[PDB]
Symmetry: D2
Subunit: 459 residues, 4 copies
């Protein structure tokens, strides 16, 4: 430089340095990094790169390092870049000699990825459990409240009565798909990348099958270049989370709407709401709004990882370092949101009366038509008839359920005495007996169906 201005800090530049450190967050990989180093150690042994004594020397030291981590006893170094350097710097202050043999044939490229996949395999496990717990909860409450009725909506307009349980099962069913997707992602995560070296593979011929068995992975990567540069397992996870958050954001929207004075169908426990000091009736759905806001947080990370991966040349690049924080943040968010959601549906109260009061006779206008279709009349005919029925009561200035059986017969001779069954909102939902419908029997069918899916997924 010097012929012009600029930034001449020297031969280091602290900005470039902290902006390069990852220990601030990858530090959580200490558990799996150690674990992953013990397995490589046993690998080198069989390969004949160290002795049964050197292995136990190293192996043992590693356990001492882990212990320090589990006690908060581990003294980190500003002289430390990442959790990888930290662990083998300590493993060197406890063994010195052999310690500098563990990384033989190993690169940070295939080492770090092994740590991330190992760590995720574990985190995705708990996520699977937290999710099955939310589904099981929703399903159980659905069975308990199978006889409550409230309105179903389209364009957010009251359409017709439905079972509150049906509404619950509608979100549960979507979540089981999220549950199914997580399981598929978990398989592709359970693949051992260790032994790929920096790009061309392991040069000293260590056993890949052994390493695979040690760490208990499901398989080994087919290609070293892919294994060290691909991040499909991270992108896939982020999308899974994003689509799951979509569903939760929808359940949040519904519930938030249902607890407005305007609807008053549901009410949240004080544990998940915030009231007004001078207004006892004002109960803000903080919890629900929080959940809804997290859908963007999550989707954005996914969008961000995709733009980072786009157009990168083979093989390994520093750009790949952006994966860790993304996974961490989304992992925490998903755990919190899932548990908070389980607590909400678990402790929310419903107002059966308000729910029943939102049902009105004008919703039955169409049931009147179905009554005629079972009598043999074509739909167009019945629809037109029920139309006349609607028009009648209107002029008479009364409700559709106040038309006399005689008045109805001036519409069609098919209207018999049983027509009073149409005026029952209960009778209305029972029409949908076809599998997947809102009829009580169908809801039982759904509950069994979901119970089984959960079971098949436990395997």
């Amino acid at each position: 430089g010097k012929l012009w201005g600029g930034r001449f800090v020297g031969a280091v530049d602290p900005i470039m340095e902290k902006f390069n450190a990852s220990i601030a967050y990858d530090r959580h990989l200490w558990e799996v990094d150690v674990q992953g180093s013990k397995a490589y150690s046993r690998g080198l042994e069989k390969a004949g790169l160290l002795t049964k004594a050197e292995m136990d020397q190293i192996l043992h030291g590693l356990d001492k390092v882990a212990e320090e981590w589990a006690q908060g006893t581990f003294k980190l170094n500003s002289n430390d870049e990442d959790i990888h350097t930290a662990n083998e710097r300590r493993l060197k202050e406890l063994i010195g000699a052999t310690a500098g043999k563990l990384h033989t044939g190993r690169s940070r490229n295939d080492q770090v990825v092994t740590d991330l996949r190992l760590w995720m395999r574990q985190t995705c496990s708990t996520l699977s459990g937290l999710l099955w717990e939310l589904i099981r909860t929703m399903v159980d409450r659905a069975e308990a409240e199978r006889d409550v009725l409230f309105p179903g909506y389209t364009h957010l307009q009251r359409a017709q009565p439905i079972r509150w349980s049906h509404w619950i099962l509608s979100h549960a069913v979507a979540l089981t798909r999220d549950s199914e997707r997580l399981l598929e992602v978990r398989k592709r995560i359970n693949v051992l990348p260790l032994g790929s070296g920096a790009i061309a593979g392991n040069p000293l011929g260590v056993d890949r099958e052994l390493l695979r068995a040690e760490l208990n992975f499901g398989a080994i990567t087919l290609n070293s270049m892919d294994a060290t540069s691909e991040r499909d397992f991270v992108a896939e996870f982020l999308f899974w989370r994003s689509l799951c958050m979509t569903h939760l954001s929808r359940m949040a929207e519904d519930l938030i709407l249902y607890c407005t004075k305007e609807f008053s169908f549901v009410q949240l426990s004080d544990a998940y709401s915030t009231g007004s000091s001078l207004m006892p009736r004002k109960k803000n759905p903080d919890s629900l709004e929080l959940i809804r806001s997290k859908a963007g947080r999550v989707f954005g990370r996914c969008a961000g990882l995709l733009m980072t991966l786009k157009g990168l040349p083979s093989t390994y690049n520093k750009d790949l370092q952006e994966d860790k924080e993304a996974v961490f943040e989304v992992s925490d968010t998903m755990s919190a949101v899932l548990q908070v959601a389980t607590g909400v549906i678990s402790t929310l109260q419903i107002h059966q009366e308000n729910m029943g009061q939102a049902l009105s006779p004008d919703m039955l206008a169409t049931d009147l038509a179905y009554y005629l279709v079972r009598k043999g009349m074509p739909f167009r005919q019945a629809h037109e008839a029920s139309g006349k029925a609607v028009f009648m009561a209107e002029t008479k200035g009364v409700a559709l359920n106040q038309l006399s059986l005689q008045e109805l017969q001036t519409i069609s001779p098919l209207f018999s005495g049983d027509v009073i069954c149409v005026w029952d909102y209960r009778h209305s939902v029972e029409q949908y007996g076809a599998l997947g419908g809102t009829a009580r029997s169908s809801v039982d069918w759904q509950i069994r169906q979901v119970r089984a899916l959960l079971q098949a997924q436990q395997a």
Copy 2:
């Protein structure tokens, strides 16, 4: 006042959903077939419907079908032409059915076809790549990290790295296809079918893997659209890397490959400047595909139960993304099968300084710990430096100055073919590992087609 021209045009969908004509009739025919089993139609009335419905398909096939100015969507157009074709018996078709569960059935049916075609194209591209790898596994060129020459590797190992990524894309497509294959029909407008139609019958007629569990979910969820769009996005990511790599290799600077005249554009006054048009188009679609995916998730976010007009935004995204993938896969397949590698320039890019590390492995392989071996290599590096000659030009005696272990073997290290063969552990670039890889993807691929 009573009607706004923009509002109508805005609300119109016939423009694009007209592509659903064929799957639409299939859905209707099957519905009517299950409609009479419920007693809503007479064996005679069904025949009318079925027969007349075929008449409708026929016109679409010949391109004689006359869209009406009053036609809102494909669902309406087919039912209008069915009416004026067989009378009012046609107005019995829709009984107990809603557009909510009818539209989604068509979309799924349409997607089930297209995705089968995509799986096909994708498998062919992967197949084309593995085949090429098998044939050129002798070729050697440089491997890169931070776009900085690292070490020699097999050109087949490079092809395989990408082939394997696409193989995962193939697997994800199959999982998505399983979830697409679920019947929503008989779910009504929101609460289900009120006239007791048999859904297992509909499922059997339309060949679906299963039926939907919940009516509210079946007519409002668009997971199968989102998944599909994401699948395409991640797959494009893979093609963009491959395209980036090839564009780089086509430069005068790298000069490793040359595209055929079919996927490249030349210069009139410069017969040596060929533009990777094809490759650049492939890379530009990554964003286009992702944008739809992004746009669709933002649309689904925060919608309340159950059905809302916002869902009408699925079709165009599916159509656009499907067309894009179809073309991009074929083009990619075309460039891969006809490109031409320049072997001499690839080997010419290999240098002896890339072999410094090998000298280290050489030492550890016969004794000393890695640490010592590395430091021993640094001396061999510095030595040849001060003497102005590549490591390759360093005499056995001189190396022995660093360590006694530098036996006669050391000469083999100077051979790139030896360097690559060091990686036999499964997944490495050694020829035997490549054979293994070729057999694995080949097997893996066979499993996905069963």
Copy 3:
């Protein structure tokens, strides 16, 4: 082999860029005009070009123009028809010009027109809203936080909240329009114009605010496309909130407004169920617009210098997003000018418990610190609770039980009209503040049109 049908179709752009026909001729005419000032054409040759170029526009106007099967893009079609129209003199037009700087000039010219039209539509929508606010400033309904009834406010204050947000959108559009108005022509393929054509002349002829500073940037940057797409995205965000609000208010539950039959769909058997079709469409476009924006940024990311085929992805995004905004603004304008508020239901939603806070302000206003006043209000709340009567039904004597300050005034607190008038500080919901707001946006709006 030598030609792949997919590759061509894939590379084709005439399908959509045909919309650039008119701006294309303008660009060419102006170029030729500056081409002869440089001595490359004879005053006679220019006339040929100019005259013949008009002939080309003419055909496009009448729709008599015959696209050729060999036509790649609009730029080619217009030059092919110019040739076969006035001879080889036409082949002198492109001298020193490149598609790189020609295409970008057309896009900018096209956008400069469209954005002027959008600014117009947007201003009308804002205008329509302010006018309505002025007319209905007496109306009072509830304000919400966490969708939980908070306090009474003016319905005009609600309209103004949105109007003001759109006003910022209007301002951003104007800044974007300034950057769109820059001439790229005379920038060549990459290094600039080699034949010394005068760029200030071209700029003057085409009415551009300025010329580009650097040829490499002028033919590769697409900032003006990105900015525009983001502008639309943030504007859609605003319309989606407004749409969400109105859809909510249209529900039976809130029943505050009713859309006219032009922007809503009804039910045959339920004459009281009107669907907010229009509103739902507007909200669904937020994602569509954003997707393009997202997709385009991902396309620009990581491209090396200078021009690459990836840039061909700008046009469709611009066209699609422009059409969407045009319709969405008009529709929104239509619903706002014809919707109908239900005043009784709006006031009916107001409750006395919303006035609890006012009693507190009442106390601080005449003495005691806020803390004491609040606690004093809590007692008035609890009191009326245990007695089973709203705060409104609490007698002066009883309130005095809490504090002596509860003079006769207290009765005014029970009037919602008094509650709202408490907010006179500029920007509040008091009527005088609303008048102020109406005058500010009106003034602000006038400044943007000068």
Copy 4:
């Protein structure tokens, strides 16, 4: 609950609580929160809500609180939710009485936003400076190295010689637009939202103009509902950053490419690169790759904020809380990347020779044609002629610049003796004299033009 399983933690739930805290990050708003409280204090005074003594009582206490923050002396409370509660909890332990009068008529809704805008106004200021510094640096080096030549590319294929300075100015020019956009965003940020209350406005009629003058804002918000719920200023900023990162990612791609053995035009200082232990020639562009990876990080936050804002109902909602961390993270990233970029272009070395060697005669084939066009020949004619010229040398098996003047005349009689000027790459770039072209004079024009823009922006 209880009739089914679920999460019954009680009346609190620690998950919902930490997932609700913001002090972990909003703590940085302590500077501006205090500042913003001093101004509201003076507001209440004039409005007559407190005495000249109560104001000084409160006002003074606030300064003591600030001081504790600046010393690290401030003792935070797990009993603290956000930086807002923290500051007035301390302001209460130092004044007790009056302390509970500062928040009169003020809501956390208009308070928090004032803090964010106040904080950003300040952060965007330094960002403007860091950016002008990068531009000034690039511009200065462009002037110093105006006589270096290397190839210009299209489709990443060598096209024709250009000035290295022109390439530099191409990115500088784009960045000045980023600079212009930041300035526009800064205006819309400098608007005072304080005095909007929670939704309806300030109830006690405090002076909005006063507050505006105290905090030195540029204007006051027109509407309380908008002022407390809109976040355009945050979204706008995030996009600005995203589009700026697009440009930097492009400069990174170029430079990364230019420092490959294949190109070898540029080399980075050790301060911003990482070499290989056993390979001294291998210099990895870590710094550049880092910059490139950050474009996705940033864009993703923007995408995330937009999805969060979409469809939210009026007025204030908890979802709006997602704004703080987004701004913070992107703000730090932009500061680091801009400085790192200034250090890179400031200290990178070029290899004039390698750059000159990448230029080849076949690039001049077209210049040969321009030579004839100035001679009067139409372009088609000249292009065809230069085509024949190209074909000739090819058959003769020699370079285009080795054709004799006589050989050239067998092509066209117009080829004179000065044609040897075409064979000079220097002569080639000098053809582009039209403003914006790569000719030396044009580059001077550009440098003056940018110098002036920077100046007009300093105002």
